[PDB]
Amino acid sequence: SKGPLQSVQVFGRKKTATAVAHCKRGNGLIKVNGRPLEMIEPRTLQYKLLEPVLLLGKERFAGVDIRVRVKGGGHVAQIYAIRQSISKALVAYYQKYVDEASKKEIKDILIQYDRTLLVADPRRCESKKFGGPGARARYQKSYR
Amino acid sequence: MSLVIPEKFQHILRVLNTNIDGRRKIAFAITAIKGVGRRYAHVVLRKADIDLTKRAGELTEDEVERVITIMQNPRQYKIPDWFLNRQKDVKDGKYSQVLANGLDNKLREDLERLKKIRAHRGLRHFWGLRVRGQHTKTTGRRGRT
Amino acid sequence: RVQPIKLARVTKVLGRTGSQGQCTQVRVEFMDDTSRSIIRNVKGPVREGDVLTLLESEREARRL
Amino acid sequence: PGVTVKDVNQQEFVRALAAFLKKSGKLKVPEWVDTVKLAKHKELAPYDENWFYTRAASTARHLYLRGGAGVGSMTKIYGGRQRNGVMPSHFSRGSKSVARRVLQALEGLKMVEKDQDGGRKLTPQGQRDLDRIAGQVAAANKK
Amino acid sequence: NLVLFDKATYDKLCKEVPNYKLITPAVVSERLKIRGSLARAALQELLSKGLIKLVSKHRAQVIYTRNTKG
Amino acid sequence: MGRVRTKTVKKAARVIIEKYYTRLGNDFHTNKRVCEEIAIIPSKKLRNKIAGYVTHLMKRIQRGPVRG
Amino acid sequence: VRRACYGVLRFIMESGAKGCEVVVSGKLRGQRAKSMKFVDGLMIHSGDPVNYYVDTA
Amino acid sequence: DIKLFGKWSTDDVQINDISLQDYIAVKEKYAKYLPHSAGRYAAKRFRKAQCPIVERLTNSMMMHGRNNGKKLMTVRIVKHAFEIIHLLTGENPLQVLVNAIINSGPREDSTRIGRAGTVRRQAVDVSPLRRVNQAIWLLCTGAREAAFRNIKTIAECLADELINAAKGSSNSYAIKKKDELERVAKSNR
Amino acid sequence: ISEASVFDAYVLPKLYVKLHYCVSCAIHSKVVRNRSREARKDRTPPPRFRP
RNA sequence: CCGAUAACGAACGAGACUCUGGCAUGCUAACUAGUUACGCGACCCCCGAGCGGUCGGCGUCCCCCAACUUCUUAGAGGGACAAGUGGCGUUCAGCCACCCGAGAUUGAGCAAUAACAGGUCUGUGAUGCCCUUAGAUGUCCGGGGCUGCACGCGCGCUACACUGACUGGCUCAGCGUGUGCCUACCCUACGCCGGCAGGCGCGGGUAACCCGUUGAACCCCAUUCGUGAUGGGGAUCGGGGAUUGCAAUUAUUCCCCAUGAACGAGGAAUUCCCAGUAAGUGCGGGUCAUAAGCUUGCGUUGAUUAAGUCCCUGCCCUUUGUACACACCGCC
Ligand SMILES: [Mg+2]
Ligand SMILES: [Mg+2]
C-alpha cells in the first residue's frame, strides 16, 4: 500500500522494435509513450493490445502502474512488442515481489493463449543476394 | 437536400464551341474544354465563389456566364501568370490562356512557325519524329505502323 | 443405385505415387464396418489417424 | 480530470482546434490560399478551403509534441508520396513557403515563440488553450 | 446510372428502402439504378430522417439497416 | 533431416570412450565437461558434437557390445 | 622447369612444412601453352585456417 | 466469451462431419480475439490445421500483387463481411462460414496423369486438409472475381458469395467449380 | 464389367500369346537389357516381385 | 555415415572453419548511449483526487552535485548436442512426432583433382609477335557521333483500376554517407524571399557529439469520386521558370500551367520461388559538375502451396559398345 522501490523494467521486442515496460506499484492504469492504449492508431489491432489485460483480468492490474517506451520497427511489430513486453513485465514483477505459486496460474494462461506473449519471435530478416532482387528470388533469365 | 433532378436541368448543353457534361462534377466537367485542366477548374470555380459538390446540370445560367467570363479573363481576376498556358507569348509577349479551338490554332501556329524557321524541332515535327530527344530505336513503332 | 457417402479412417500411409509423388497410397478402414479396409490414392497431405470421406467403397486404387 | 492532448484521438483534436481557430479570427492568412498546392507531389489543391486552419491545427500540436522544429522539419513532416509519372515513386518534402506562412501566422497569434536554438516552441498560454481544447473535446466525445 | 433522383425513384426509395435488411451504397445503387454518390447522399439523408440505423461508419464502407421491429 | 555425424567426430568419440570409459557417464553435460579437459578440441561446436555422440554410445555400451 | 621446381620443392619441404604446391603456367618453346604442377605434402583450400596456414605467392 | 470482433461467441458452432471437425480451428482453444497472429503456422507440415480458420480467410484474401501484405485491410474486410452476413442472416457468422466451407469441400478430383501416354485424368479422392484449402481458395477467388469491375464492394460480394455457398443453391462460384470437379471425377472415374 | 455382367459369377477369360523378338526389337523395347560380364553368366530368370 | 565386404589404415573436397541471426535483467563498463529516481519549472486540473497527469521542458561530471546498465553500444564468455520422451528402423546408421527450451535446418564467405583454344592485349609502367611512328594509328584542341529509325529480340519501370484514385489528418525503420595529396566537387540544422523548382544570411559536423530522436513509403483514419478509357493511365506534345557546367539544341536535371495516346489483365511459349521467404513499399551506396527506370545493400508490411517425385528438362554414378586417344568439333 506504501512500498517504495517496488518496480521492474522488462522489455519485449519484435523485428528491431524494442519495447521496455517500466512497471511500478500504483493505481491500475496503462500508458504507452504517454497515451492510453485505447488511443492507438491501429484500432483494428486495439483488441490485441487490450487482449493481455483481458486474459488475466483488470483485477490483477488494478494494483500496478506501468508506462511503456517503444522505439523501432513498424506499427504492427510495435504492437506485438508492446503486448509481449506488457506480459513479460507483469509476470516478472509478480515473481519478483509476490509468491510465484500464484504466478504459475497466470503464466500458464499466458503461454496457453499465445507463446508469443512471452517468447519473442526469433526470425528477423534475410540478407539480399547479388543474383536476384530479393534474398531468394532470381532475375529473369532468357535463352532467346 | 439530395432531392430529385431539378426542373432547371440540361441533360446536355453547349458551352462556347463544344458541349459539356452536366452529369459530371462541376469542376471535372468543364475540363472537357480544350485548355482547362482540373487545377484551373478548381481555382476558377473558387474564384466564381460558387458551390463545388453540385453537378454541372445544377449550374444555372447566371453561374455559367460567370464562369465563362472568369475562364476567358484570367489575369483580369487575379489569376497568377504562372498558372497560365501562353505565359510570355512569342508573338505579343502577353500572358494568356488558350481555350477550345484557340489552343489548337496557337499550337499549330507554333508548329508551322517552327517549320518556317527551319529549326531542328520543326523538322522533327514535320517528319513525325520525336522532338524531346528521346530514343526511337525500339519504341514508338506503333505510331509509324 | 447411388452408394451412400461415408467416411474412412487412415491406418497408415503406404507411400507416394502418381508419376510425380502427388498422390499417396493409403490403407483406410471404414468406421461403419471396422473389419473391412481398402487401399486408396489420396490427393493432399494426409497423416495417420485422421478421417476422410469416400464417395464409393467397392472402388480401389491401383498403382499410380 | 486533467486532460492532456495526448489523451484524446488526434483526428478529433485537430479538427476541433481548426474550428477554434476559425471562430477566433486572430489568425492571419495569406491571399493565395485558394490558389497554391500544399506540396510538390500533390496533383491538386486540397478540397476544404479552410485547409489553412486545418494545417495550423496540425502544426500547433506537432510543435507541442516536439519543439525546435523549423521549416525543414515541417516540410519533412508534411512530405508525402510522389507518383512521379512513369518513374517509380519516391518521397518528397512539401512546400516550404507554406510552412513559413503557418509558422509566422502562429507567431502572430502569439501562442508560439522562437527558441534560443533553431525552430520554435509553444508558449505557456499556447498549451493552456490547447489543453483547454483537448478537455472540452474529450468531454464532448465521452458523453 | 441516374446521377440524381426523379419522380419514380425518390418516393420508391422513401417507401421501400427501410423494409429490407442490407442497406449499403453499392447495393442501393445497383438496385435503384442511382449513381453511387447519390446513393451516399440519400442514405445519409435517410439516416438523418431516422428510418434506418447505422452499423459501421467506416471510410471504405458504411452500413445501414432497417429499424428493429417491435 | 541431415543429422549424420562425421567420421571425425565419430572416431574421436570412439577413441575417448575406449580410453576414458570410467570417467564418462550417461549425461551430456558431464560428458562435455570431461571432454573439455581430456582432449584438445579448439571448437565448442566440435566439442559438444563429440559429447552427444559419446552419450548416445554410452547408452548402448551400458547394455551391449559395440564396435569400440 | 622440372629441375628448378624439384630443387625449390626440396628446399621448401625439407625446411619443414606440411605441404607445398608449385604451379608454372605459360608457353615454353611451343605456341599451345601448358601448365605444370608439382605438389606434395598436404594442402587445404577452404575455410578460415587456410588464411593463416597457407602462404601464397 | 472470446468475442471475435467483440462479439460472435464461438461456443455454439459445431462441425457436422469429423473429416473437417479435426482440421477446422474454430474451437474454444483456437478461438482468437483478432484474425491477426504471427504464429509461424507455415513452419512445417500440418501446422495450418490448427491455425484459426478466420486467419486462413484473411491470409487467402490478400492476393494478386497489388495487395499482398495488407493483413489489416483483410482483417477489416472480413470484419465488414461478417457484419453484413450477420445483418442479412442473423445466425453465427462462424457457423455460416464453416457450413459454407463444408458445402464447398470437393471430396473428389482427378490427378490428370492417369496415363502418361495419353491424358486420362484418373479420378482420386481428396484429403480433408486439401478439402478445406481448396474450399477457402475457391471462395476467396470467387469474391475476388465478383468485385472486380462494378460498384459492388469487396465485403458485400464476399458476404453474398459466402452465404450462397453455405446454402448450396448452385449460384455460388465455389459451388460451380466444386460440382464440376466432382463431375469430371465421375466422368473419368 | 463385373457390375454390368448378367451372370452371377463369370471369371473373365485371359490372353495366351507367345511373343517372339529379334534382339534388335527386344533391346529397344526393354524386354532384355545389357548386363555386365559376370552378370551375363547368370541364366536363371529375374524374380517376379509376386509377393 | 552405418553396414556386407580382400581389403585395413588414411588424405583432399564436403563437413569441420570465419562472419552474420536469434538468448542470456549473468560479468565487464559508458555525458559522443542512456534508464529510473530526486529537484526546479510550464500546462491540465480544483468535483477533490495531489506520491494526479504530459513534457524529446531544465538540471542532479554544471562536477561534488543520485544511483543504476534493463533499454543502446561491444567485448569476454556461456548456450544446442538429435540432449530428453515416445515411435519406426537390421534396432545399426539414422528418420518422424512431442515436452522443456532463445533456438531442434539463420543466412552467407571459403571451397578439391581437372577441363572448357570460354571472356578479357579496351584495367595495368603484365606481356610475346605484327603494325604505326611526323600529313602519327603518338599527343592536344574545335565540332559531330557513341542516342541516329520501315523492323526483330532481351532485361526492366508505369499502369489497365473502387482490394482503387484524389484530398486532409494520424504516424512508426535500418543499412549507411558526409569538407577531398593530386582534385577546383562535402552532408546539412535555422531565419527570411518566392507557389514551385529555387535564392540569401547565420551556423553545426573530419562525425554514437551535427544533419538526426534519420518525423520514409506503404499502412491507418475521415471526405470526394462512382464502373464511365472516369477523377485510372500519364505516353506524346506547347508555353513558361530555375539549378549544374565554358558550353543544355539532338530537348542534362528539376518546377508550374496546358493536351490526354495505347492499355479493360494479355496467344502459343517462358521465368523465379518454401519463412520473415514470395510479394508490395519506400531509403541508402555506387555511377555524379548534373542526375536512377540499373545495380548493390537496408528496412516496413507481409502471405498461398509443399515437406514429395523422376513425368518433362538437365547433370552425376554404375553397366555396356567402341576401329576414338588431336579423344565425335574424332576416326573414316
Ligand atoms: Mg565448409
Ligand atoms: Mg500537360
Side-chain angles (χ1 to χ4, degrees):
Chain A
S1 77
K2 217 175 189 179
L5 296 173
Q6 200 154 18
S7 64
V8 310
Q9 274 183 349
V10 183
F11 83 94
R13 70 166 87 110
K14 169 175 191 295
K15 284 182 75 172
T16 77
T18 179
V20 180
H22 169 48
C23 164
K24 69 200 280 193
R25 146 171 284 171
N27 306 293
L29 70 96
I30 174 63
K31 263 191 168 175
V32 291
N33 261 307
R35 69 205 57 167
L37 71 91
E38 293 97 2
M39 313 320 297
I40 209 60
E41 322 161 5
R43 279 130 52 206
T44 175
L45 278 164
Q46 199 255 339
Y47 286 156
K48 277 204 63 62
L49 285 189
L50 56 88
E51 178 259 333
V53 304
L54 281 197
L55 282 196
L56 70 160
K58 37 176 68 184
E59 303 322 289
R60 299 196 176 103
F61 285 81
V64 80
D65 191 352
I66 50 188
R67 285 146 153 87
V68 193
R69 39 180 169 87
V70 185
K71 271 200 294 194
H75 312 142
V76 187
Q78 273 200 351
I79 294 315
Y80 274 68
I82 284 160
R83 55 184 272 277
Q84 71 183 0
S85 177
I86 283 299
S87 309
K88 288 191 57 174
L90 186 52
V91 69
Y93 168 93
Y94 208 81
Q95 65 94 31
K96 176 182 195 305
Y97 288 114
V98 294
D99 71 315
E100 67 258 5
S102 191
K103 177 260 295 185
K104 174 65 73 173
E105 60 95 16
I106 78 162
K107 185 180 184 293
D108 61 346
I109 304 185
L110 291 175
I111 60 178
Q112 73 92 35
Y113 193 96
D114 197 358
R115 184 166 160 86
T116 78
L117 288 163
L118 302 171
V119 171
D121 216 345
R123 63 177 184 174
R124 279 287 171 79
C125 204
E126 208 163 311
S127 309
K128 185 194 174 298
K129 276 74 182 175
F130 51 87
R136 283 175 209 248
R138 306 296 97 190
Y139 285 122
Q140 289 279 294
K141 66 174 294 190
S142 69
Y143 324 110
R144 262 73 176 262
Chain B
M1 38 185 171
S2 305
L3 295 179
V4 306
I5 284 172
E7 277 66 37
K8 278 74 182 173
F9 197 89
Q10 276 91 21
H11 276 279
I12 183 66
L13 65 93
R14 193 80 184 270
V15 159
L16 274 75
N17 293 162
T18 179
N19 50 14
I20 53 148
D21 195 352
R23 282 88 58 86
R24 301 178 58 187
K25 185 63 72 70
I26 182 62
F28 295 93
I30 74 156
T31 53
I33 316 295
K34 196 67 57 65
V36 52
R38 42 186 93 196
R39 276 276 273 134
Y40 192 78
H42 270 79
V43 70
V44 302
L45 269 296
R46 194 88 56 77
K47 284 197 168 286
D49 278 327
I50 52 178
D51 205 8
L52 185 61
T53 193
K54 66 202 200 76
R55 301 321 204 283
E58 312 285 311
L59 208 76
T60 46
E61 177 266 335
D62 49 285
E63 303 176 305
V64 179
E65 59 95 13
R66 173 181 290 157
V67 303
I68 59 145
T69 56
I70 286 292
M71 78 185 300
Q72 284 145 7
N73 295 60
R75 203 175 160 186
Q76 278 75 22
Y77 292 99
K78 298 288 98 175
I79 286 281
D81 309 327
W82 54 263
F83 214 82
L84 295 191
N85 294 347
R86 294 314 294 243
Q87 316 172 6
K88 198 173 159 282
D89 210 356
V90 78
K91 300 292 279 182
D92 59 5
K94 195 52 74 201
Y95 296 84
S96 53
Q97 189 92 2
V98 285
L99 278 302
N101 43 38
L103 160 61
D104 196 0
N105 192 7
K106 297 297 118 180
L107 165 62
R108 174 200 93 103
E109 190 82 23
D110 264 331
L111 299 185
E112 65 200 335
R113 77 155 290 283
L114 284 171
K115 166 178 162 186
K116 278 295 182 62
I117 66 181
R118 292 300 303 253
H120 199 213
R121 187 151 53 103
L123 303 161
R124 294 305 290 251
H125 277 283
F126 194 33
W127 291 330
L129 305 175
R130 293 293 146 89
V131 306
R132 301 203 199 285
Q134 61 262 69
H135 296 179
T136 42
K137 186 172 178 185
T138 69
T139 54
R141 294 174 180 163
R142 178 177 294 279
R144 303 306 290 169
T145 44
Chain C
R1 194 60 195 168
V2 163
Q3 211 258 338
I5 293 94
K6 59 204 170 318
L7 300 171
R9 166 171 322 283
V10 173
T11 74
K12 52 161 304 307
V13 159
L14 270 296
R16 304 265 176 169
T17 194
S19 190
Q20 273 157 344
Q22 78 272 41
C23 290
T24 288
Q25 310 282 124
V26 68
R27 164 57 81 79
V28 295
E29 49 182 359
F30 309 100
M31 69 285 301
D32 313 330
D33 171 40
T34 59
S35 75
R36 175 171 163 86
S37 53
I38 67 165
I39 54 169
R40 198 59 75 105
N41 50 356
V42 303
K43 167 86 175 300
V46 55
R47 68 166 86 160
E48 54 186 1
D50 72 330
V51 291
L52 59 87
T53 181
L54 281 178
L55 306 195
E56 275 177 344
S57 173
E58 197 181 9
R59 291 252 56 77
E60 52 263 2
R62 312 288 280 146
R63 313 141 185 171
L64 270 75
Chain D
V3 162
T4 307
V5 304
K6 311 174 74 177
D7 311 332
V8 307
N9 209 286
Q10 293 302 324
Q11 303 293 319
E12 197 50 48
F13 167 78
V14 167
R15 53 198 59 246
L17 198 155
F20 163 76
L21 281 194
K22 188 45 179 281
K23 293 303 118 182
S24 286
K26 168 162 38 173
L27 195 66
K28 188 259 176 184
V29 301
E31 88 283 343
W32 53 63
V33 286
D34 52 17
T35 309
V36 297
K37 288 179 303 192
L38 298 200
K40 181 168 75 178
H41 38 273
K42 290 305 157 47
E43 288 192 10
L44 176 57
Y47 293 158
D48 202 337
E49 55 89 19
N50 289 326
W51 62 260
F52 205 94
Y53 318 111
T54 314
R55 191 149 302 278
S58 176
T59 190
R61 62 138 304 276
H62 273 102
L63 275 75
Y64 176 90
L65 266 300
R66 74 167 89 169
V71 176
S73 160
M74 272 313 117
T75 56
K76 183 197 293 188
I77 286 175
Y78 293 143
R81 183 175 184 173
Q82 188 170 0
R83 299 296 303 276
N84 287 108
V86 76
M87 304 296 174
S89 305
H90 291 313
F91 164 70
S92 167
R93 303 157 88 92
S95 297
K96 312 160 67 168
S97 86
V98 58
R100 291 181 314 127
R101 274 301 180 271
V102 186
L103 265 59
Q104 289 159 317
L106 263 289
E107 189 91 37
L109 197 144
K110 298 214 201 61
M111 51 169 160
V112 63
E113 87 265 15
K114 295 267 204 80
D115 315 328
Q116 66 270 2
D117 67 298
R120 301 149 210 246
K121 84 180 301 289
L122 258 59
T123 68
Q125 181 50 244
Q127 92 258 29
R128 164 190 304 268
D129 62 72
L130 292 204
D131 275 328
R132 198 163 315 277
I133 300 294
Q136 58 163 0
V137 75
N141 185 67
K142 65 166 292 197
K143 299 285 99 175
Chain E
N1 275 322
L2 309 179
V3 57
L4 290 155
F5 280 107
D6 51 28
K7 184 52 210 64
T9 309
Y10 178 81
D11 70 325
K12 165 182 169 194
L13 171 137
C14 298
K15 84 168 292 308
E16 86 167 8
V17 168
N19 261 327
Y20 56 101
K21 314 158 268 288
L22 191 59
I23 313 294
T24 68
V27 159
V28 69
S29 163
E30 162 59 48
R31 173 164 284 278
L32 305 191
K33 315 308 291 305
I34 55 186
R35 177 69 69 194
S37 50
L38 180 77
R40 278 175 288 103
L43 265 296
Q44 87 193 11
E45 286 307 310
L46 211 69
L47 178 81
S48 56
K49 296 291 279 292
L51 303 175
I52 45 169
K53 74 168 185 281
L54 181 143
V55 185
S56 51
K57 183 47 78 172
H58 182 254
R59 52 160 207 86
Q61 195 160 4
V62 286
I63 304 168
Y64 310 98
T65 181
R66 55 194 174 155
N67 267 306
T68 63
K69 309 305 192 293
Chain F
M1 295 100 77
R3 293 300 191 81
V4 191
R5 272 75 65 93
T6 316
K7 73 184 165 297
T8 285
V9 49
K10 273 183 189 269
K11 266 158 69 175
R14 287 197 194 77
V15 162
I16 65 188
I17 278 161
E18 299 199 14
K19 278 167 79 181
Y20 292 94
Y21 155 74
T22 63
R23 211 168 309 177
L24 276 176
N26 219 9
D27 171 46
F28 166 76
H29 308 299
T30 311
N31 295 2
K32 62 169 165 47
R33 284 308 168 187
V34 307
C35 281
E36 174 69 34
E37 61 178 357
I38 68 172
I40 301 280
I41 297 96
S43 175
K44 162 144 52 171
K45 203 188 184 184
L46 211 69
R47 187 273 309 278
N48 46 29
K49 270 177 172 182
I50 288 172
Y53 199 58
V54 161
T55 314
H56 182 42
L57 266 67
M58 271 283 150
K59 288 212 312 179
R60 287 186 86 217
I61 79 172
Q62 75 95 18
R63 63 178 180 182
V66 300
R67 191 60 53 97
Chain G
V1 169
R2 294 201 201 266
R3 262 193 70 176
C5 282
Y6 296 162
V8 66
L9 203 77
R10 281 178 285 258
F11 184 32
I12 292 161
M13 264 309 300
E14 265 80 359
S15 82
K18 191 59 61 67
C20 54
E21 154 188 344
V22 292
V23 187
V24 168
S25 304
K27 39 174 286 197
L28 303 176
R29 264 202 180 211
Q31 293 304 104
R32 186 52 179 156
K34 197 179 73 174
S35 306
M36 273 200 179
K37 214 148 183 168
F38 315 92
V39 55
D40 58 0
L42 190 149
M43 265 286 314
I44 62 176
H45 311 76
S46 74
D48 177 39
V50 75
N51 308 321
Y52 57 93
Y53 282 157
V54 168
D55 185 14
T56 66
Chain H
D1 205 305
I2 296 301
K3 299 285 96 177
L4 171 58
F5 289 119
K7 63 183 74 174
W8 309 318
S9 72
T10 75
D11 44 39
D12 69 304
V13 289
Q14 82 180 9
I15 305 106
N16 49 20
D17 47 19
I18 324 293
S19 62
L20 279 75
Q21 190 271 332
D22 51 15
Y23 281 109
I24 290 295
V26 77
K27 293 306 293 180
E28 66 256 13
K29 61 163 173 163
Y30 301 144
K32 200 60 175 61
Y33 283 12
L34 274 179
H36 192 295
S37 52
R40 301 177 277 176
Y41 307 127
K44 65 182 54 179
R45 211 167 162 217
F46 291 116
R47 291 276 310 179
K48 67 186 82 159
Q50 290 78 30
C51 166
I53 49 164
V54 58
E55 178 100 9
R56 315 285 305 281
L57 271 299
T58 50
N59 275 344
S60 311
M61 186 42 67
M62 59 190 86
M63 274 291 292
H64 292 71
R66 56 185 181 180
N67 51 7
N68 274 359
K70 297 173 176 62
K71 206 164 170 59
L72 309 180
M73 168 148 74
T74 66
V75 160
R76 68 157 175 74
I77 277 175
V78 76
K79 183 198 180 77
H80 295 349
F82 281 169
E83 291 292 340
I84 289 152
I85 72 185
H86 199 89
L87 267 67
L88 74 95
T89 79
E91 58 262 21
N92 217 13
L94 304 98
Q95 183 68 249
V96 60
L97 184 68
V98 177
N99 293 335
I101 286 296
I102 290 157
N103 265 269
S104 64
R107 306 159 293 281
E108 282 193 356
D109 210 4
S110 298
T111 196
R112 208 193 180 278
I113 324 292
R115 187 180 40 216
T118 302
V119 54
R120 187 253 175 285
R121 301 172 66 84
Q122 164 74 67
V124 300
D125 63 341
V126 178
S127 170
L129 182 52
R130 194 53 189 276
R131 295 262 318 270
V132 298
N133 294 1
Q134 288 187 357
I136 186 170
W137 180 78
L138 276 196
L139 272 177
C140 292
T141 193
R144 186 159 320 119
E145 283 301 315
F148 192 31
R149 321 278 316 290
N150 49 19
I151 190 69
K152 197 163 51 166
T153 76
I154 179 67
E156 198 273 340
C157 85
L158 170 68
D160 50 59
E161 172 80 6
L162 281 166
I163 302 152
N164 293 10
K167 297 311 286 315
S169 52
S170 193
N171 55 10
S172 177
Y173 182 77
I175 307 288
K176 295 164 204 293
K177 291 184 72 67
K178 198 267 290 182
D179 301 341
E180 187 52 66
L181 293 187
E182 286 274 10
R183 268 173 274 178
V184 309
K186 305 284 165 299
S187 165
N188 44 56
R189 177 174 289 168
Chain I
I1 288 291
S2 78
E3 294 295 291
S5 79
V6 284
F7 301 100
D8 51 356
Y10 186 36
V11 182
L12 296 174
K14 306 289 98 174
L15 275 80
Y16 310 99
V17 56
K18 183 174 184 176
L19 278 301
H20 298 286
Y21 283 101
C22 77
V23 54
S24 305
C25 280
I27 281 174
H28 161 262
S29 300
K30 301 185 178 63
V31 167
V32 297
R33 284 90 177 273
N34 64 331
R35 291 196 291 176
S36 82
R37 210 168 198 175
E38 200 73 40
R40 286 180 201 123
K41 289 200 168 181
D42 184 77
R43 294 189 96 242
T44 184
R48 302 290 321 205
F49 286 111
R50 36 176 67 247

